[PDB]
Design an enzyme around this catalytic site. Sequence first.
Site, PDB file in Angstrom:
ATOM      1  N   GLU A 791       0.864  -1.169   0.000  1.00 21.48           N
ATOM      2  CA  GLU A 791       0.000   0.000   0.000  1.00 21.48           C
ATOM      3  C   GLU A 791       0.901   1.220   0.000  1.00 21.48           C
ATOM      4  OE1 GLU A 791      -3.711  -0.685  -0.119  1.00 21.48           O
ATOM      5  OE2 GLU A 791      -2.318  -2.105  -1.044  1.00 21.48           O
ATOM      6  N   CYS A 825      -0.561   9.727   3.603  1.00 19.63           N
ATOM      7  CA  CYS A 825      -0.573   9.233   2.239  1.00 19.63           C
ATOM      8  C   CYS A 825      -1.789   9.749   1.485  1.00 19.63           C
ATOM      9  CB  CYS A 825      -0.569   7.711   2.249  1.00 19.63           C
ATOM     10  SG  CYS A 825      -1.822   6.964   3.300  1.00 19.63           S
TER      11      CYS A 825
HETATM   12  N1  LIG Z   1      -1.287   3.543   0.812  1.00 20.30           N
HETATM   13  C1  LIG Z   1      -1.300   3.751   2.215  1.00 20.30           C
HETATM   14  O1  LIG Z   1      -2.231   3.371   2.910  1.00 20.30           O
HETATM   15  C2  LIG Z   1      -0.165   4.480   2.839  1.00 20.30           C
HETATM   16  C3  LIG Z   1      -0.253   4.791   4.215  1.00 20.30           C
HETATM   17  C4  LIG Z   1       0.756   5.517   4.877  1.00 20.30           C
HETATM   18  C5  LIG Z   1       1.872   5.880   4.154  1.00 20.30           C
HETATM   19  N2  LIG Z   1       1.985   5.528   2.798  1.00 20.30           N
HETATM   20  C6  LIG Z   1       3.168   5.941   2.117  1.00 20.30           C
HETATM   21  O2  LIG Z   1       4.244   5.717   2.982  1.00 20.30           O
HETATM   22  C7  LIG Z   1       5.215   6.680   2.677  1.00 20.30           C
HETATM   23  C8  LIG Z   1       5.770   7.331   3.934  1.00 20.30           C
HETATM   24  O3  LIG Z   1       6.223   6.394   4.877  1.00 20.30           O
HETATM   25  P1  LIG Z   1       7.773   6.090   5.046  1.00 20.30           P
HETATM   26  O4  LIG Z   1       8.532   7.354   4.787  1.00 20.30           O
HETATM   27  O5  LIG Z   1       8.011   5.439   6.365  1.00 20.30           O
HETATM   28  O6  LIG Z   1       8.045   5.107   3.820  1.00 20.30           O
HETATM   29  P2  LIG Z   1       9.243   4.294   3.394  1.00 20.30           P
HETATM   30  O7  LIG Z   1       9.034   3.666   1.999  1.00 20.30           O
HETATM   31  O8  LIG Z   1      10.330   5.251   3.532  1.00 20.30           O
HETATM   32  O9  LIG Z   1       9.491   3.340   4.516  1.00 20.30           O
HETATM   33  C9  LIG Z   1       8.503   2.407   4.895  1.00 20.30           C
HETATM   34  C10 LIG Z   1       9.056   1.146   5.557  1.00 20.30           C
HETATM   35  O10 LIG Z   1       9.813   0.373   4.642  1.00 20.30           O
HETATM   36  C11 LIG Z   1      11.061   0.148   5.266  1.00 20.30           C
HETATM   37  N3  LIG Z   1      12.054  -0.010   4.227  1.00 20.30           N
HETATM   38  C12 LIG Z   1      12.841   0.938   3.603  1.00 20.30           C
HETATM   39  N4  LIG Z   1      13.586   0.352   2.663  1.00 20.30           N
HETATM   40  C13 LIG Z   1      13.305  -1.007   2.637  1.00 20.30           C
HETATM   41  C14 LIG Z   1      13.748  -2.090   1.904  1.00 20.30           C
HETATM   42  N5  LIG Z   1      14.740  -1.923   0.884  1.00 20.30           N
HETATM   43  N6  LIG Z   1      13.237  -3.299   2.149  1.00 20.30           N
HETATM   44  C15 LIG Z   1      12.294  -3.529   3.096  1.00 20.30           C
HETATM   45  N7  LIG Z   1      11.841  -2.491   3.846  1.00 20.30           N
HETATM   46  C16 LIG Z   1      12.320  -1.253   3.626  1.00 20.30           C
HETATM   47  C17 LIG Z   1      11.274   1.265   6.211  1.00 20.30           C
HETATM   48  O11 LIG Z   1      12.230   0.983   7.170  1.00 20.30           O
HETATM   49  C18 LIG Z   1       9.913   1.388   6.769  1.00 20.30           C
HETATM   50  O12 LIG Z   1       9.616   0.507   7.796  1.00 20.30           O
HETATM   51  C19 LIG Z   1       4.598   7.673   1.752  1.00 20.30           C
HETATM   52  O13 LIG Z   1       4.999   7.423   0.469  1.00 20.30           O
HETATM   53  C20 LIG Z   1       3.159   7.410   1.904  1.00 20.30           C
HETATM   54  O14 LIG Z   1       2.387   7.799   0.810  1.00 20.30           O
HETATM   55  C21 LIG Z   1       0.962   4.829   2.113  1.00 20.30           C
END
Ligand SMILES: NC(=O)c1ccc[n+]([C@@H]2O[C@H](COP(=O)([O-])OP(=O)(O)OC[C@H]3O[C@@H](n4cnc5c(N)ncnc54)[C@H](O)[C@@H]3O)[C@@H](O)[C@H]2O)c1
Lengths: 1214, 107, 54
Positions: A791, A825
Amino acid sequence: APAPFADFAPPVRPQSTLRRAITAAYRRPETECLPPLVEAATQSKEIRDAAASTARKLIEALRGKHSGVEGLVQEYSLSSQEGVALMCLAEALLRIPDTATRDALIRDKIADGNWKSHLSRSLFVNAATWGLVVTGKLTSTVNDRSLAAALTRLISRCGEPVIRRGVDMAMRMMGEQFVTGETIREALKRSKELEEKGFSYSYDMLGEAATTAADAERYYRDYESAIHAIGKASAGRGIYEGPGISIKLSALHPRYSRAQAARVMGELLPRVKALALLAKNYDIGLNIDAEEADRLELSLDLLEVLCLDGDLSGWNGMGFVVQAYGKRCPFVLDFIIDLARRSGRRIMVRLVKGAYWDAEIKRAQLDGLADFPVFTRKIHTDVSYIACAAKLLAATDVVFPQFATHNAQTLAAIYHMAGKDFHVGKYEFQCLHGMGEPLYEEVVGRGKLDRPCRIYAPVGTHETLLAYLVRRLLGANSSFVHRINDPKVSIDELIADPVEVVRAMPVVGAKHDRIALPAELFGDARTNSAGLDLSNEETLASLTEALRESAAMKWTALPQLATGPAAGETRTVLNPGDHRDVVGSVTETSEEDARRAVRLAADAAPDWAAVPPSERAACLDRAAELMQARMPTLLGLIIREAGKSALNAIAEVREAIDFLRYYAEQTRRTLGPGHGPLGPIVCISPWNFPLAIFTGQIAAALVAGNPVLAKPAEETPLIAAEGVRILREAGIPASALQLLPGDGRVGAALVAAAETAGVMFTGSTEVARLIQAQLADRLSPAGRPIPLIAETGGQNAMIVDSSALAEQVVGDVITSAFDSAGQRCSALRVLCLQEDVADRILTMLKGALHELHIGRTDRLSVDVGPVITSEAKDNIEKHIERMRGLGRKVEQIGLASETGVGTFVPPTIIELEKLSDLQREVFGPVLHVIRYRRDDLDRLVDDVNATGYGLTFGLHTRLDETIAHVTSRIKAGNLYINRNIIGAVVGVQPFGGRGLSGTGPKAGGPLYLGRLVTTAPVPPQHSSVHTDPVLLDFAKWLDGKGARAEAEAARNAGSSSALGLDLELPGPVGERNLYTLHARGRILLVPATESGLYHQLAAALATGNSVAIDAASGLQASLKNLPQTVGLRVSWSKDWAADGPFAGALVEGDAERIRAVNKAIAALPGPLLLVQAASSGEIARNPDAYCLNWLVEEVSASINTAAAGGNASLMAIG
Amino acid sequence: PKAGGPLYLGRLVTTAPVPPQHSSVHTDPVLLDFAKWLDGKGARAEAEAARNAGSSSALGLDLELPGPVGERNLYTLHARGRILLVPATESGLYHQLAAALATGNSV
Amino acid sequence: ELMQARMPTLLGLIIREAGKSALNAIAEVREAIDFLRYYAEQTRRTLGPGHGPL
Ligand SMILES: NC(=O)c1ccc[n+]([C@@H]2O[C@H](COP(=O)([O-])OP(=O)(O)OC[C@H]3O[C@@H](n4cnc5c(N)ncnc54)[C@H](O)[C@@H]3O)[C@@H](O)[C@H]2O)c1
Ligand SMILES: Cc1cc2nc3c(=O)[nH]c(=O)nc-3n(C[C@H](O)[C@H](O)[C@H](O)COP(=O)(O)OP(=O)(O)OC[C@H]3O[C@@H](n4cnc5c(N)ncnc54)[C@H](O)[C@@H]3O)c2cc1C
Ligand SMILES: OCc1ccc2c(c1)OCO2
Ligand SMILES: [Mg+2]
């Protein structure tokens, strides 16, 4: 460095005993409020008979003299829609200023045919208001195509005469009935007639709900100019005989709220004082109108200061409204009477019932509060009113009671309660202009009851009057004015004594049967989470202490393996709003321990799967209870760790509670022995909803019977660790829930671990793409793809047309774009304004932007907190400067020096030329604005869709044709009509998008748990009676080709598909929350055999999709001579990357073929594809080899049905 | 048009009136795509005619008619099907297409 | 109104000329009455000076 929460929400003043008694009644149970009111309102039998006789006499006089619109409708045999359309046309014609030009347009152009040619703005923008005028019924949106048809029909049938009559009727209603006059001078001239008969006036310049400083200044100068005109005309008549003015505090400051109390006292109060000083000089009344319930107590702080201000001494004209529909009313009156005594000012107290009833019901439900701040049975308000009148009538030496009511029964009761001794100045009645005169002409004057009545007199232009006319007209089935005109309502019914009726009920003061308390919105399914009332001083005082206590806690997050906490690299967690504020310490997980955790989870998988689903669900419910009880402490951690305001932290904790209870209930509805868990699930969560999304993913995986490796975002491990601690306390075994703090390396190590059986990811699209690539290498022990829920980001738009109410739009835009500094998001990224209203809305939006308070979020007055890290700040600022370098107009709030200790980005508005100016999601407080011409609306929707995202989308319009067009063409998972686009509610707006925004299924929706088991259950309510017609054509084709078993499988898929499901989900009043299943789009089919191809095609077509079939399969000869309907849905693809984006994929092959195909699919540009794979033998053996749940797209739509200004359904609730 | 229905009288006059209840909030999506295509070609009058047809079309009307209890009597407007277009001029063809597409038809 | 008042006589003619049963003759006359009143009402709802006859 200021101590955390040391200045969270200090009250304006220490709360006196009388003020505390008010606050204590705020949401008191209705059964506790009524008995003292019944007692206070009790009168003697002799009085009750006299009151009933007087009421009957008044009502007989009213009914004996009882039409303008009704006579027009009758004369021209108009349908209701024709009547409404005619009034809209008349309204538009009256916007033409010159009478000769208007009459010429009518005679020459309008009457002779195409009215559409001569009249950027729909004629029908205000048709909901005219609908209320014509039909007495409120509709939230306007069927503009019905009205256009009706207007054409009536003009073609009746011509100029009907237009002339409509224009004259609208001119009279808008210039003389809905307002006393267009200007204060006109209103004053027109007031002489009734003043000579014994009425008085209080003028309302119609200012309300300032959005900007400029608005507040305009309303101020309107009030000041009106005071001069009224005072000049009063000419020494004084405050009782002479006219006065009424003001709304919300008109005088754009941030009139308890959260901004300091600005209210510093900035709004001096403005009221200046107006009061002028009213004092002319010796006229100045009344403070009462508004929403969350402004009542704040307004008392202004009343107190004004009444104690010696500069206003000598003047008794200060007035204040109290709303008898409110549970605090008698206690407010005790406070006011005491203030009158202390100050020596004879406060003018207008007793009203209250104007915001529907809105208060909705607000309390939305906020999950303990109870309503208003009564829920109309008769309770009537008893409250009479009880409060008894209190006022005992204090006429120190206050001047003003009984505002159109209800002849209420009037009669008070007339006899007050007794025969009367003098002008003792008390008065009040009524509304153009509504109350028929009743009060039976009251005022020596030949009647010889009691005075003050007419509340709206003054303003057509544009101003129409803004909130809907509220003023609600005309509801419970309203006296509606009932007086209902021939089926007897006079005996109208003179019924509410005091005695309530006294005789089996339970005195019981809540209305048809209004749910906020906790009960979902009935037997689950308990709604509870919020906190940040306007309640008791709540604020207790929260202040709990928040301070939370900052004294040694919050930590450790790698919590099944075997116990593990060692690792430890660092502090700093408050993003002030790096000097250390929130806690995180010990991060080594990649070795992450792999060990997965092995421990795999070893623990059988034991956790063996816990019956009901008991797993009971753990979730226990965790929900624990989070509810711990909410104050959780708020404090979220506020300091994640940059959230208190309001947003409350919503965050509520969402976590709701996820727990929703997935628990969904489990109890579905999961049985045949829905085996996947195995260890890796839950990777984002920082920005650090408790809610974190809890939701884990709770779903756990309750589905999977042990979980929980990897919270590196920025926000502390609240995650607390969530894990709560889940463990609720009974989740340590082996079933392991917390692995750390950065993306820990997430990646978990994803790559051999025993990982599924991945739930919420985060950026780019990171999800890396995870998708990792998993493309991988197969389960059964040789099938590892399920991934991903998501991801959004590029969320709101489209606003010229029918939308600018103040409503701006509030929803400011909230959607800048709440949480745009770090949702769902946040609004692109506001699209129809060209004709763009400048006005943009001006209002910029003005509202500058009223936001940005800072460290441990103060209630902070609207916008920090961005999470310096890197996020740098990324956002780089985008802003790129835009600024391109020449785009950039509006930014100025930041206080105090922001220097944290990482802040000011809320920013960037005006774009094209939607293509944006590349990827900018996760910060940056709103982009595009303008569009009405005829280009469809192209604009294409442009929004063309980003490839599809998360949230908003539309502000009153026009059904525009709603139908836009919602049918937009491709996004969560749609919002006439409201903000954020704060989706679990089980009400199941949340999640498509394209670059998500794979689905939606979190907080009914398909979610089924993705976390090997065989998906049938979700509650999940079926459809509709059969895709292309599927049916394909089934017939299959039979014609001799593929009899496949044709049967195709028919079965047609029936099994839930495409076309269309449900309304239970939620708050004043909103319609819809959930529908649509096709996903174009599904990539990668078949191996002819039969596999036919099964894949049947699955895809039954779910409404088109397909692109792998041309390398060599199966082209298997689809010869397709019916045209099926051929239209079929393409063959030799270059899959050239023919996307796809919305899913179906793969047939052995394990290594599946692995190879999965790698090729992962390499496709754009959205992550939900891939389902099966072997040829599996297709033969299992009719559900490809699950249809994952071939439909869920769409949630939330429609604010109160946006027109009232709730039609609640007009029937009394 | 059907006897005993609201479109009938309009066939017996030289300019049809707008029947009672005869409207729809739905806009044919192919009509919308045609209007955008006309826009892109600069066929401004034709694009306007297409948008107007899209709005005035009653395709998708779906009404329950008053009648006896114990019965639901529904009245709906669907596309006719495939319409034969016999144009003479390019603009005429664009207008014919607009009319037919706005009412859900193929041609 | 005239067809409604004369329905019994009209039924007799329809029964004997067209082979209808009494119930079907009643339905026949009722339908004629309904056409008359329906087209009358539809006219009152729609027809104006610009809707010229053929
Ligand atoms: N569609 C939804 O419901 C929804 C909800 C909330 C946030 N978001 C999205 O989330 C983003 C913001 O959150 P964020 O900054 O924490 O996102 P992110 O992509 O930076 O990080 C999310 C998670 O993924 C982990 N991560 C990072 N690199 C990884 C890898 N190579 N492999 C596995 N895990 C990894 C991070 O440590 C963290 O736990 C925004 O883009 C937002 O739009 C989407
Ligand atoms: C001169 C004047 C000034 C006013 N100023 C204000 C003001 O400053 N602020 C304000 O909020 N209102 C104000 N009002 C009142 C509001 O606008 C309505 O006019 C008033 O509440 C209608 O009450 P009524 O006694 O005339 O009629 P009634 O028909 O007797 O009472 C209707 C009222 O009952 C209440 N009600 C309806 N349904 C329910 C229910 N299910 N449960 C509980 N209560 C219910 C509502 O308050 C509703 O307005 C004013 C009214 C007048 C005449
Ligand atoms: O229509 C009467 C009325 C007067 C003042 C108000 C109000 C209604 O609502 C809040 O302030
Ligand atoms: Mg990141």
